[PDB]
Design a protein around this ligand. Sequence first.
Ligand SMILES: COC(=O)c1ccc(CCNc2nc3cc4nc(N)[nH]c(=O)c4cc3[nH]2)cc1
Ligand SMILES: COC(=O)c1ccc(CCNc2nc3cc4nc(N)[nH]c(=O)c4cc3[nH]2)cc1
Ligand SMILES: [Zn+2]
Ligand SMILES: [Zn+2]
Lengths: 369, 369
Amino acid sequence: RPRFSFSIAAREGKARTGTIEMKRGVIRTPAFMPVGTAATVKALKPETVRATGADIILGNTYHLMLRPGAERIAKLGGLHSFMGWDRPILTDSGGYQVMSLSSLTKQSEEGVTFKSSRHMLSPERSIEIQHLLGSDIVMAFDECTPYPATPSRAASSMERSMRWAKRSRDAFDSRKEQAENAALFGIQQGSVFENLRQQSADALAEIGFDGYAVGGLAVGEGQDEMFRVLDFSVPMLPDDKPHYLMGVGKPDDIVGAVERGIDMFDCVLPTRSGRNGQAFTWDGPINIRNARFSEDLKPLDSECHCAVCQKWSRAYIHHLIRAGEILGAMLMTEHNIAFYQQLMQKIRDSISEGRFSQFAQDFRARYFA
Amino acid sequence: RPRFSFSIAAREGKARTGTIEMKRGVIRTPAFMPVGTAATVKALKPETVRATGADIILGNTYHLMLRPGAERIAKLGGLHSFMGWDRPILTDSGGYQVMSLSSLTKQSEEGVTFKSSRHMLSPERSIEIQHLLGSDIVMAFDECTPYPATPSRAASSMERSMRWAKRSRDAFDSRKEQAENAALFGIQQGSVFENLRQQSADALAEIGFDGYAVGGLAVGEGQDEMFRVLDFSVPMLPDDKPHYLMGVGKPDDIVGAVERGIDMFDCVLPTRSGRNGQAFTWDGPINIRNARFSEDLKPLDSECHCAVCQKWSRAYIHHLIRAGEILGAMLMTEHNIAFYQQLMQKIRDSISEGRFSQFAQDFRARYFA
Ligand SMILES: COC(=O)c1ccc(CCNc2nc3cc4nc(N)[nH]c(=O)c4cc3[nH]2)cc1
Ligand SMILES: COC(=O)c1ccc(CCNc2nc3cc4nc(N)[nH]c(=O)c4cc3[nH]2)cc1
Ligand SMILES: [Zn+2]
Ligand SMILES: [Zn+2]
């Protein structure tokens, strides 16, 4: 019923748990968003994505504007109807993918021109594409500063992102239907530099957003450095709005980020690694292709509540993946996404119950044994 | 409850409809068996295969004996438990696939030695592999005569198959658990030659089987010739047992074969063509990759009752297949197998109601319009 309402139900240290209520559904936080870049969470029907526990999925302005096209998706009824997912969708703004995937780019104050075949992205165009898609959470159009960067290059990059954040805010607010039905998140930049992170947080808070992402991380800096930056960066963001760490991550990354005040996550790891034969378990990842699993009748994980672990053995899935069978990718992906959702549920419950510190400790001791 | 009981409920001309009762379930006839060569019906969970209406699926002695291995599958609890399909499974005997897929073969009265890596198949070994798999319908080990063949080569080939049929019968009967719980089908050979087909039918009937397959067809002869051979060959088989046409086929092939007395079918077409972008419809096949479907909001088929057609558009599936997305293969395959099952249901109902001739006419007029 509400457009966007974030409520924090419980806290432990910097960790929080609660809910975001939106018109298309409730998002339990901390939340993990399966990635659906090509208007599909790879190898899963939307009903299966929901069955694993996902409340919201992620889509991408960059990919969808190229294929099948934003105007086309709008003509077909919007992204939700198109792919058959009726719950909230967050869309990245294109700011990162344009620089990561394009064959040629030209950057300027206006935006980014690129070859996929020539196209343009700008704060205004990004917001309009996300409107055409019918995104529930719209990301500001930003620049993900390369890593490493000199302080001066990080500063000029972050400042451009802040000017683009204001343009994103204005474009979103100009579109009445979008402003009434969707939410807009700003993206903090500043590389690894505390003063720049502060300047970025200040600029975003002055503009005002429904939520705040920590951008510019998970770009090769490694966990120690990422955690160091989160240590000072997250407290700079408004406490009363959600905090979204873009592109993170491995299970231990998620746990440590929640310890540092992050509420939302997305990553291709569970889907991509699932297809590649890696299954997540409470005792750490396993590669199901390994010969040691060829006659193993146990499920992928001994505690996992997912449909895959209720029905099929490691031995069968091993056979499927080694044979290159589509069902192998399906089962591995469903299990991995379910594992990620169970991780988030355990995080939420432990924070609610004031035992998250103990959970994090127990989780790590077992996962890395 | 019974091991194997075939009942014919209704007839129209040469067409029949009825049921095969087996310990693991009832098979409604005429029946279409989805193919699950690598211990999976490609891109479908077993529950989805069942949801489309399938009563029985097909597996393959040749593929499974190589990967993951027959003794291995038995150690893991049998094929049913391994893949999660608890209903009847028919297994081909290896007789056809060994000659179709092997890199090198040596044929003799004993059987066939082949390179996948050196292995052997014989009537006794084939029956034992099918026992280890836990097949419900076991096929005799035969030789699918190449096409075309001289009458003399067809004759010597068919005669060897008949000697192998008796050895198959004896091997099956020697295994008490198999003889008590499974059924054994013989395979008629004789190429396109009426006298040889008759000699083959006579030999098989003298031995006695639970069902009779028409082998040696769908080998490049084309529909006209296949129908010509079926015209005289099917009446040679015992009327009171099921008639199984191996490897057939396209929807019109199935309809014409039922008109000629066939009760059971298997084919990779719906699964394989589904993955390749071909969808079956009552107005004929379509290729969903075609640009004409890019903004088509209609389901794959306007009448189809399957879950895919209830939820997703041609436009979305077009996008998925062009993007190489696994969900594209999943949805196309589910629809195609569901279409095949709906075809079989319409065939069964029309025979039951004494209007199958009219159905065949109406079907063709529309399918080929
Ligand atoms: C050498 O590179 C690497 O090691 C490496 C490590 C992790 C990822 C996972 C993805 N991480 C990630 N996704 C991201 C997406 C983003 N989107 C926007 N709009 N702005 C950002 O600031 C941003 C940062 C990201 N970081 C990708 C690359
Ligand atoms: C040039 O070749 C072609 O045109 C062509 C046409 C259709 C198929 C589909 C498959 N047809 C088929 N599968 C078959 C499987 C069989 N198994 C046994 N044990 N004995 C047979 O006698 C037999 C015949 C078959 N015929 C395969 C090949
Ligand atoms: Zn699981
Ligand atoms: Zn359908």
